[PDB]
Amino acid sequence: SFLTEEEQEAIMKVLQRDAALKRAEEYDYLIKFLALGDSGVGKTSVLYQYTDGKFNSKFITTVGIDFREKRVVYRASGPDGATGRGQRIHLQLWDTAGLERFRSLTTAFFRDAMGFLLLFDLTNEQSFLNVRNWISQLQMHAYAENPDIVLCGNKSDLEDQRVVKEEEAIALAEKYGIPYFETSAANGTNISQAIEMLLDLIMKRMERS
Amino acid sequence: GHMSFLTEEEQEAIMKVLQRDAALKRAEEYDYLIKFLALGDSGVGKTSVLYQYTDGKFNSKFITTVGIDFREKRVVYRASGPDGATGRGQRIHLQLWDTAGLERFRSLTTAFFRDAMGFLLLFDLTNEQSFLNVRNWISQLQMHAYAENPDIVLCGNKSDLEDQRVVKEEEAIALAEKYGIPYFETSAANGTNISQAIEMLLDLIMKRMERS
Numbered sequence: 001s002f003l004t005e006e007e008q009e010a011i012m013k014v015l016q017r018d019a020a021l022k023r024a025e026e027y028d029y030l031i032k033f034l035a036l037g038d039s040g041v042g043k044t045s046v047l048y049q050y051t052d053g054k055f056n057s058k059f060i061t062t063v064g065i066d067f068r069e070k071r072v073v074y075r076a077s078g079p080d081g082a083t084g085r086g087q088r089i090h091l092q093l094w095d096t097a098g099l100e101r102f103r104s105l106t107t108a109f110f111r112d113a114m115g116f117l118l119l120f121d122l123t124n125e126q127s128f129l130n131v132r133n134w135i136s137q138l139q140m141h142a143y144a145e146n147p148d149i150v151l152c153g154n155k156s157d158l159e160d161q162r163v164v165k166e167e168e169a170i171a172l173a174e175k176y177g178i179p180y181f182e183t184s185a186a187n188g189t190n191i192s193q194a195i196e197m198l199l200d201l202i203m204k205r206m207e208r209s
Numbered sequence: 210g211h212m213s214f215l216t217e218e219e220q221e222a223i224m225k226v227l228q229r230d231a232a233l234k235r236a237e238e239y240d241y242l243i244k245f246l247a248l249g250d251s252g253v254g255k256t257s258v259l260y261q262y263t264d265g266k267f268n269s270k271f272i273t274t275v276g277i278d279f280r281e282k283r284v285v286y287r288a289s290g291p292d293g294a295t296g297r298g299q300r301i302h303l304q305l306w307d308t309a310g311l312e313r314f315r316s317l318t319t320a321f322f323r324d325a326m327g328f329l330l331l332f333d334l335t336n337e338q339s340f341l342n343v344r345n346w347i348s349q350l351q352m353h354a355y356a357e358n359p360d361i362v363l364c365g366n367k368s369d370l371e372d373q374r375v376v377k378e379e380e381a382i383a384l385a386e387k388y389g390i391p392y393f394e395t396s397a398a399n400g401t402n403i404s405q406a407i408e409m410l411l412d413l414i415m416k417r418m419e420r421s
């Protein structure tokens with residue numbers, strides 16, 4: 001078991017990199033958010049796909065905590081399909097280990113998030129079932145009582161082993177008022193649609209300020 | 210080395226510390242919340258200094274901090290002035306992070322540097338080794354504070370032990386000057402300078418804050 005020196009140095013590396021990044025943003029605005037979910041659901045894969053278009057299938061469980069950036073451009077996303085001239089958005093995309101060994105390390109990074117990507121594994125029902133607790137965890141620890149969440153039933157490319165019925169998943173999302181997307185980190189289905197939704201939900205919350 | 214992962218109990222603690230923090234923060238979403246953070250080697254006096262500060266009390270049993278905690282104290286801060294021009298009393302809600310010191314908690318404690326507008330660095334006067342590591346703490350603070358050239362006050366703690374004092378006074382004033390930081394010699398037991406150092410830190414933060 002016992003946590004090793006080499007793994008802490010990586011985490012100090014991520015931390016050292018975040019601390020550097022914040023010091024510089026000091027684009028148009030920096031929009032931070034955070035992906036979480038049981039481990040082995042594709043947080044890293046999903047984010048990797050989204051940023052780089054690639055996908056490794058070797059499972060490399062996240063060493064506690066990591067983050068990525070995309071310099072995307074956000075546009076209006078207005079009513080009945082409008083689009084006013086949109087902004088530059090530096091993105092920061094936290095990736096949390098879903099394991100026990102880091103439940104208390106990852107939960108400290110919620111404070112830096114402005115939205116959330118809650119992931120489950122369409123091929124693993126317990127991923128789906130534990131989704132309620134994850135949401136509980138987010139109201140309890142995020143920095144607004146009703147934090148913006150987009151849910152993702154990831155691994156949509158593995159139909160011959162999909163045990164979560166879209167009915168049950170849409171029903172869970174409707175019960176909380178959270179957008180649902182079924183996603184694949186293999187081939188990128190809805191990977192863009194889903195995080196951009198969060199971005200809209202997040203950017204629109206700032207124009208309520 | 211062989212650093213143990215957090216037991217569930219250990220993680221139980223820290224999760225409710227976090228839960229505590231979340232509420233505090235959300236609640237403040239007639240004041241001015243100010244935070245800072247205690248750090249330095251294990252056993253140098255970190256919690257005790259803070260417990261002396263908030264409750265005017267001291268406990269002899271070493272109760273090593275399980276990763277992270279924080280204490281609060283309401284206070285009134287009045288501006289400094291060029292000819293004793295002390296300004297209006299500001300209510301200042303104070304959150305005081307107490308970080309562990311054992312290395313096995315290093316990356317958990319460093320996470321919280323983004324929440325701390327200043328740092329209270331402790332070594333022990335009865336332990337030169339703790340005093341020697343202080344350079345590496347400042348280097349860890351330059352590296353991971355979310356503002357650069359961050360505000361630090363350095364505390365030589367345990368000053369009420371003079372038969373056990375080993376850190377020469379001059380070596381510390383030296384350091385504190387080379388790095389240009391306030392140095393205080395403190396006692397978490399009798400309370401000598403505890404208040405003065407913490408008041409100094411908030412002052413720095415306060416003046417630093419209104420650079421605008």
Ligand SMILES: Nc1nc2c(ncn2[C@@H]2O[C@H](COP(=O)(O)OP(=O)(O)NP(=O)(O)O)[C@@H](O)[C@H]2O)c(=O)[nH]1
Pocket residue numbers: 037038039040041042043044045046056057058059060061062063096097098099154155156157158183184185186187
């Ligand atoms: N077919 C398919 N496999 C995927 C997809 N996303 C991840 N996987 C696979 O599922 C496993 C889990 O990947 P990973 O990104 O590490 O998941 P994670 O939830 O971030 N793990 P951790 O929480 O430990 O960081 C890997 O073997 C990966 O290749 C996806 O969209 N489709």
Ligand SMILES: Nc1nc2c(ncn2[C@@H]2O[C@H](COP(=O)(O)OP(=O)(O)NP(=O)(O)O)[C@@H](O)[C@H]2O)c(=O)[nH]1
Pocket residue numbers: 250251252253254255256257258268269270271272273274275308309310311366367368369370395396397398399
């Ligand atoms: N005589 C004396 N004892 C002190 C003083 N400050 C702390 N102590 C004692 O020395 C030990 C230091 O304990 P404590 O300050 O709680 O540890 P800490 O700095 O928070 N380290 P940790 O990272 O393990 O939580 C305890 O036994 C405490 O009671 C002081 O000024 N004088």
Ligand SMILES: C=CC(=O)Nc1ccc(S(=O)(=O)N2CCC[C@H]2C(=O)Nc2cccc(OC)c2)cc1
Pocket residue numbers: 021022023025026111112113114115116142143144146147148149
């Ligand atoms: C939970 C999600 C939700 O639904 N709402 C929600 C909850 C929390 C947060 S937030 O706490 O993370 N947050 C607000 C904006 C940025 C940051 C902040 O406050 N300050 C800051 C200031 C200066 C610099 C700096 O980086 C360099 C950062 C945002 C949205």
Ligand SMILES: C=CC(=O)Nc1ccc(S(=O)(=O)N2CCC[C@H]2C(=O)Nc2cccc(OC)c2)cc1
Pocket residue numbers: 358359360361362389390391413417
């Ligand atoms: C607070 C301590 C800390 O840990 N970090 C930290 C330190 C300083 C600042 S500072 O911007 O305010 N500042 C500008 C220069 C120094 C200092 C100042 O005002 N006067 C001064 C003090 C000593 C010698 C000296 O040379 C003539 C001048 C901000 C953060």
Ligand SMILES: [Mg+2]
Pocket residue numbers: 042043044045060061062095096097
């Ligand atoms: Mg991962």
Ligand SMILES: [Mg+2]
Pocket residue numbers: 254255256257272273274307
């Ligand atoms: Mg302590």
